[PDB]
Design a protein around this ligand. Structure first.
Ligand SMILES: *[C@@H]1O[C@H](CO)[C@@H](O[C@@H]2O[C@H](CO)[C@@H](O[C@@H]3O[C@H](CO)[C@@H](O)[C@H](O)[C@H]3NC(C)=O)[C@H](O)[C@H]2NC(C)=O)[C@H](O)[C@H]1NC(C)=O
Ligand SMILES: *[C@@H]1O[C@H](CO)[C@@H](O[C@@H]2O[C@H](CO)[C@@H](O[C@@H]3O[C@H](CO)[C@@H](O)[C@H](O)[C@H]3NC(C)=O)[C@H](O)[C@H]2NC(C)=O)[C@H](O)[C@H]1NC(C)=O
Ligand SMILES: *[C@@H]1O[C@H](CO)[C@@H](O[C@@H]2O[C@H](CO)[C@@H](O[C@@H]3O[C@H](CO)[C@@H](O)[C@H](O)[C@H]3NC(C)=O)[C@H](O)[C@H]2NC(C)=O)[C@H](O)[C@H]1NC(C)=O
Ligand SMILES: *[C@@H]1O[C@H](CO)[C@@H](O[C@@H]2O[C@H](CO)[C@@H](O)[C@H](O)[C@H]2NC(C)=O)[C@H](O)[C@H]1NC(C)=O
Ligand SMILES: *[C@@H]1O[C@H](CO)[C@@H](O[C@@H]2O[C@H](CO)[C@@H](O)[C@H](O)[C@H]2NC(C)=O)[C@H](O)[C@H]1NC(C)=O
Ligand SMILES: *[C@@H]1O[C@H](CO)[C@@H](O[C@@H]2O[C@H](CO)[C@@H](O)[C@H](O)[C@H]2NC(C)=O)[C@H](O)[C@H]1NC(C)=O
Ligand SMILES: *[C@@H]1O[C@H](CO)[C@@H](O[C@@H]2O[C@H](CO)[C@@H](O)[C@H](O)[C@H]2NC(C)=O)[C@H](O)[C@H]1NC(C)=O
Ligand SMILES: *[C@@H]1O[C@H](CO)[C@@H](O[C@@H]2O[C@H](CO)[C@@H](O)[C@H](O)[C@H]2NC(C)=O)[C@H](O)[C@H]1NC(C)=O
Ligand SMILES: *[C@@H]1O[C@H](CO)[C@@H](O[C@@H]2O[C@H](CO)[C@@H](O)[C@H](O)[C@H]2NC(C)=O)[C@H](O)[C@H]1NC(C)=O
Ligand SMILES: *[C@@H]1O[C@H](CO)[C@@H](O)[C@H](O)[C@H]1NC(C)=O
Ligand SMILES: *[C@@H]1O[C@H](CO)[C@@H](O)[C@H](O)[C@H]1NC(C)=O
Ligand SMILES: CC(C)C[C@H](N)C(=O)O
Ligand SMILES: [Zn+2]
Length: 902
């Protein structure tokens, strides 16, 4: 046998009941410049099986407990064994208490410790975050436990299923505010040892997981509202953020969203209050700590003067995401991190539901398709993907746990759960979900528990009939990786499925229980009229008349892309759809208008249609007003841009896109009353933004003139920006493209004095749009200087230059020459060498350029490559793919564009 303290998973001999935890951050450095925090904790736990060892998590804590590292007491009249010795096992992150005798089952024990750790700027555990308010560097103390960092703040049984109540006390400077999961018990009281400090005790948490604990000490302020049921809602942020009104949007939506979910889930919000807090530079994005949710500022705050509609969308959906967790994840928690996908996939899905409640005119639900479905299909159509489900026994280390937080888990998880809600109907899904939430409140589950409760709801009715059990169906989508292409020959109605890969030559080596066969829910529209629902069983091939067409009829599968699959047809059926989109596109749901574009470009890639068929599918766009189909086009073509914008192909391409987009431009010119007013709802605003970007970047004189007039106008009155935030990135970029140092210098001016991140970002990116070599080179020489350009912005800025066709060879030469600077900013930030290499080499598509990257690599001697060591490999391999793709495609594509651009 091996010793239990050398195993990554905790024993189950001891289960926690309740913790007292007192934390004291020191926000002034101890002058060798170390920031510390101090803590004291008591954990009460119950013995289940006799054991003579107590194993508890601890990470980067020094112990100052009197005696051994802990003190051990019996609860009530329980005797307690003596401690032999206490030791720290770093690898498995344990504090280990060896006893002279055994603990007894049924008995409770209390274990006290005193400790301290660094209050580091590391976004891990109890940590510090520094930021500026005017002249002053400010410093606050805040938490991020997710996933395995609670143990970094205090010793605890730090696994999600080992839930307990927590009594939190903060000791803090007496003019700072202290926040935790729960409301404060009463007024803070002064610390007897030193009254410059106060003591804030918090009400007992519900039974909960360690990874959801939070506590924060800052000078933040709040805007507040009391929902009618008395639930207090607060948005917390920097004093000046609050004073400028930047919390108001979050406050507006929060109440409705919470309300939506309590009714959605059929389960009262389980806490007396909900705080949400905007943190500067919170690189982890957002965290759903129960009752105190943390966001990065640009995820929670919104400035109506400067922020764009897409910023607005980000805020409402992120809030909805974090709030969804307050039932799903927090109230009912997955037993182990192998099932993370459920939790994050669920939030990643219902975020759209919650947000749509708050903004019911925006059609937000649609956005899951481009946002999650097609996003994750790009990576799930690879031989190198993985199942949603991982065996529990394979997820053990903190690193292994971290690896669970990826595309597949969030976006595929969202996609397959959306599929499941749709084939069950939402009302039925809701019932099973309510049943699951009530049965498991304050406890832990596996995905099998959700299947079961959905089955119960299925079994309790007669309307929805399935081809198999919920579990049997969802097993197809959770235990094997990837997804099928579904191919329909409409001449016969034959319908087949195969595992879909973008690379037609790939060897899949990961085996499946099911031979990569799925049970597939298939909706279909024929001549614009909904057909009966069909299930493809787990067979390669089948036949149904649902999919048989006459000559002048058409059929289209997967309405609204609710199903996690792509569709191909015979060529005839494609053409009819094409002609339908030509003559009355309204017959076909906007989402499917996009599907046709997304799928066919993917199929073309996989060599299952000719690329010209995919391009034909763009032809209808000249009469398309709606956001999504255009977005499908723009997303699928950006690679064609990457590959061809230095080639003879480009002129025909631009000319084609000018042709396609001009009417959309004209449409918005009228609609927006000469551009003075924005369109009403989100989708039409998104469309306007894309149409303007596309027009301008392709050289439509009408868009070029707009951008010049507007940027001219702004320069003649710098305090009154005439450019709506929706149009800013395009108008800036185009106008700087047309202009010289007059335009460039003014914008640089505006970068240096902008106080808002979203706006600085746009200026930084537009400045890279110059068409003067000398301006792009001078700009490059700024990117390293941290006076002029922040380091965290340095490689991003170099990539934006690379992105400019003229800046490509400039960036590339610059990176080569100052590569000697792994040994200066591998020492001063992480940097992301990996993202730089990717961005600057992504256009490479010739043998000559592959010779150049190979020739670059042979500075292997010293220097090295740090983070992008395998990012270079991926560069040399991606270039090989591009060379192959360009030789196969250059001619056919050139002539398609020549032909279709008047
Ligand atoms: C975890 O923290 C809890 C809160 O601090 C502890 O419970 C508190 O214990 C306090 C003293 O140990 C009690 O305060 C007062 O003590 C005086 C003695 O001077 C007594 O007369 C009273 O019982 C009490 N005063 C009043 C006004 O009630 C608190 O009663 C008590 N707080 C509670 C129960 O909410 C836990 O004991 C601590 N856990 C462990 C294991 O140490
Ligand atoms: C938890 O305990 C650790 C071990 O005692 C502490 O780590 C020690 O911190 C010292 C600085 O605080 C480190 O510096 C050494 O000592 C003095 C600084 O006061 C320097 O002059 C020496 O140059 C320096 N020695 C070296 C080799 O650089 C010690 O390095 C370090 N000891 C160890 C073993 O790591 C932690 O600070 C302590 N943390 C908290 C938050 O209490
Ligand atoms: C949180 O919700 C509030 C209430 O629903 C929103 O408050 C509305 O803000 C609107 C945007 O400025 C205001 O509407 C327009 O204001 C301009 C300014 O002079 C006028 O031209 C328009 O006529 C006017 N429109 C209307 C319908 O009045 C509203 O004054 C205001 N409505 C209310 C009830 O106060 C908040 O904007 C919203 N906060 C955020 C950040 O979204
Ligand atoms: C955290 O605080 C709570 C309540 O303030 C404590 O719960 C009490 O536990 C004691 C001893 O088990 C019981 O006598 C009371 O019934 C509990 N009160 C309530 C309201 O439940 C809890 O013990 C504290 N945790 C620790 C570790 O002390
Ligand atoms: C809380 O008290 C601290 C200490 O008096 C204040 O922090 C000082 O702020 C001034 C400028 O206002 C700085 O120049 C000092 O260096 C600060 N001292 C330290 C140790 O940081 C702080 O402003 C007060 N905060 C609030 C919200 O009132
Ligand atoms: C959870 O859903 C249940 C069951 O649908 C709700 O109870 C229903 O409430 C409506 C509202 O008036 C009544 O018309 C139904 O007759 C009720 N059904 C039953 C069985 O009581 C319940 O109120 C919801 N609870 C929460 C907390 O949202
Ligand atoms: C993890 O969750 C399970 C349930 O999913 C918990 O087991 C339940 O415990 C409660 C209270 O002890 C009982 O009412 C049920 O009968 C139990 N159901 C079971 C055992 O299947 C389990 O206690 C949780 N694990 C931990 C460590 O808390
Ligand atoms: C449609 O599906 C059926 C299979 O069920 C195919 O018809 C069979 O094809 C084999 C191939 O040699 C014949 O030998 C069988 O006699 C056929 N079975 C029949 C007619 O019942 C048919 O080829 C498919 N059509 C396609 C893919 O276009
Ligand atoms: C496909 O998606 C569209 C939205 O893009 C759905 O249309 C919405 O349906 C709801 C209720 O039927 C309406 O309240 C919305 O206002 C509709 N929006 C639009 C823009 O039409 C459509 O119902 C979906 N089709 C199917 C068959 O599920
Ligand atoms: C896949 O295996 C085939 C033969 O089974 C081989 O020709 C090919 O090189 C392999 N790999 C790729 C990535 O195509
Ligand atoms: C286009 O089809 C829509 C929906 O079927 C219909 O309402 C509209 O009248 C049609 N218009 C034309 C010109 O065919
Ligand atoms: C790393 C954590 C902040 C992740 C969080 N649960 C999210 O998905 O937003
Ligand atoms: Zn989440």
């Amino acid at each position: 046998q091996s010793k239990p303290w050398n195993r990554y998973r905790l024993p189950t001999t001891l289960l926690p009941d309740s913790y007292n935890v007192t934390l004291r951050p020191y926000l002034t450095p101890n002058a060798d410049g170390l920031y510390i925090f101090k803590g004291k904790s008591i954990v009460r736990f119950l013995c289940q099986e006799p054991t003579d060892v107590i194993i508890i998590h601890s990470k980067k804590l020094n112990y100052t407990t009197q005696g051994h590292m802990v003190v051990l007491r019996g609860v009530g009249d329980s005797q307690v064994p003596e401690i032999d010795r206490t030791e720290l096992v770093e690898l498995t992150e344990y504090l280990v208490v060896h006893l002279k005798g055994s603990l007894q089952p049924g008995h409770m024990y209390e274990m006290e410790s005193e400790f301290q750790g660094e209050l580091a700027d590391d976004l891990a555990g109890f940590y510090r975050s520094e930021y500026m308010e005017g002249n002053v560097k400010k410093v606050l103390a805040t938490t991020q436990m997710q996933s395995t960092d609670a143990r970094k703040s205090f010793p605890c049984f730090d696994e999600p299923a080992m839930k307990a109540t927590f009594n939190i006390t903060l000791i803090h400077p007496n003019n700072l505010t202290a926040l935790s999961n729960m409301p404060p018990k009463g007024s803070s009281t002064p610390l007897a040892e030193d009254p410059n400090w106060s003591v804030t005790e918090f009400e007992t948490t519900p039974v909960m997981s360690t990874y959801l604990l939070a506590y924060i000490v800052s000078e933040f302020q709040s805007v507040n509202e009391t929902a009618q049921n008395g639930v207090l809602i607060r948005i917390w942020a920097r004093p000046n953020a609050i004073a400028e009104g930047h919390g108001m949007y979050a406050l507006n939506v929060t109440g409705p969203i919470l309300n939506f979910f309590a009714n959605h889930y059929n389960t009262s919000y389980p806490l007396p209050k909900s705080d949400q807090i905007a943190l500067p530079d919170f690189n982890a994005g957002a965290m759903e700590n129960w009752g105190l949710v943390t966001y990065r500022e640009n995820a929670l705050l919104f400035d109506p003067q400067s922020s764009s509609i897409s910023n607005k969308e980000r805020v409402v959906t992120v809030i909805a995401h974090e709030l969804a967790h307050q039932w799903f994840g927090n109230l009912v928690t997955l037993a182990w991190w192998n099932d993370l996908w459920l939790n994050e996939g669920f939030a990643s899905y219902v975020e759209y539901l919650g947000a749509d409640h708050a903004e019911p005119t925006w059609n937000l639900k649609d956005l899951i398709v481009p946002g999650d479905v097609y996003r994750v299909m790009a990576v799930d159509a690879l031989a190198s993907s993985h199942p949603l489900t991982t065996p529990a026994e394979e997820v053990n280390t903190p690193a292994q746990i971290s690896e669970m937080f990826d595309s597949i888990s969030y976006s595929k998880g969202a996609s397959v759960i959306r599929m499941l809600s749709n084939f069950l109907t939402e009302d039925l899904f809701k019932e099973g979900l309510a049943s699951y939430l009530h049965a498991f409140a304050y406890q832990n589950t596996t995905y099998l528990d959700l299947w079961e409760h959905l089955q119960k709801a299925v079994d309790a009715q007669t309307s929805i009939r399935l081809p198999d059990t919920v579990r049997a169906i969802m097993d197809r989508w959770t235990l094997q990786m990837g997804f099928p292409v579904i191919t329909v020959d409409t001449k016969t109605g034959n319908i087949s499925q195969k595992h879909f890969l973008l690379d037609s030559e790939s060897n899949v080596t990961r085996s499946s229980a099911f031979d990569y066969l799925w049970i597939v829910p298939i909706s279909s529209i024929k001549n614009g009229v909904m057909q009966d629902h069909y299930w493809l069983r787990d067979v390669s091939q089948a036949q149904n008349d649902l999919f048989k067409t006459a000559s002048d009829d058409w059929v289209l599968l997967n309405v609204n892309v609710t199903g996690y699959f792509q569709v191909n047809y015979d060529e005839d059926n494609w053409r009819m759809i094409q002609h339908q989109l030509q003559t009355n596109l309204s017959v076909i749901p906007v989402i499917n208008r996009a599907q046709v574009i997304y799928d066919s470009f993917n199929l073309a890639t996989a060599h299952m249609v000719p690329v010209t068929l995919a391009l034909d599918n763009t032809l209808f766009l000249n009469g398309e007003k709606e956001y999504m189909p255009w977005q499908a086009a723009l997303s699928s073509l950006s690679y064609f841009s990457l590959m061809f914008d230095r080639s003879e192909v480009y002129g025909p391409m631009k000319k084609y896109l000018r042709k396609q987009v001009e009417p959309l431009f004209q449409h918005f010119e009228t609609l927006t009353k000469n551009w003075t007013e924005r369109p009403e709802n989100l989708m039409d605003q998104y469309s306007e933004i894309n149409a303007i970007s596309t027009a301008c970047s392709n050289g439509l004189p009408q868009c070029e003139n707009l951008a010049k007039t507007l940027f001219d106008q702004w320069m003649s009155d710098p305090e009154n920006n005439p450019i709506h935030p929706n149009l800013r990135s395009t108008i800036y970029c185009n106008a700087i493209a047309q202009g010289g140092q007059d335009q460039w210098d003014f914008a640089w001016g505006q970068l240096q004095q902008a106080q808002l991140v979203n706006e600085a970002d746009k200026l930084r990116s537009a400045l890279a749009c110059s068409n003067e070599v000398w301006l792009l080179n001078r700009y490059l020489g700024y990117t390293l200087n941290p006076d002029l350009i922040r380091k965290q912005d340095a490689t991003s800025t170099i990539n934006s230059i690379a992105s400019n066709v003229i800046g490509q060879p400039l960036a590339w030469d610059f990176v080569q020459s100052n590569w000697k600077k792994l040994f200066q900013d591998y020492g001063g930030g992480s940097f992301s060498f990996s993202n730089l290499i990717q961005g600057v080499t992504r256009r490479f598509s010739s043998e000559f350029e592959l010779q150049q990257l190979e020739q670059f690599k042979k500075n292997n001697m010293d220097v090295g490559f740090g983070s992008g060591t395998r990012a270079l490999e991926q560069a040399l391999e991606k270039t090989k793919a591009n060379i192959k793709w360009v030789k196969e495609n250059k001619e056919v594509v050139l002539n398609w564009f020549i032909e279709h651009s008047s």
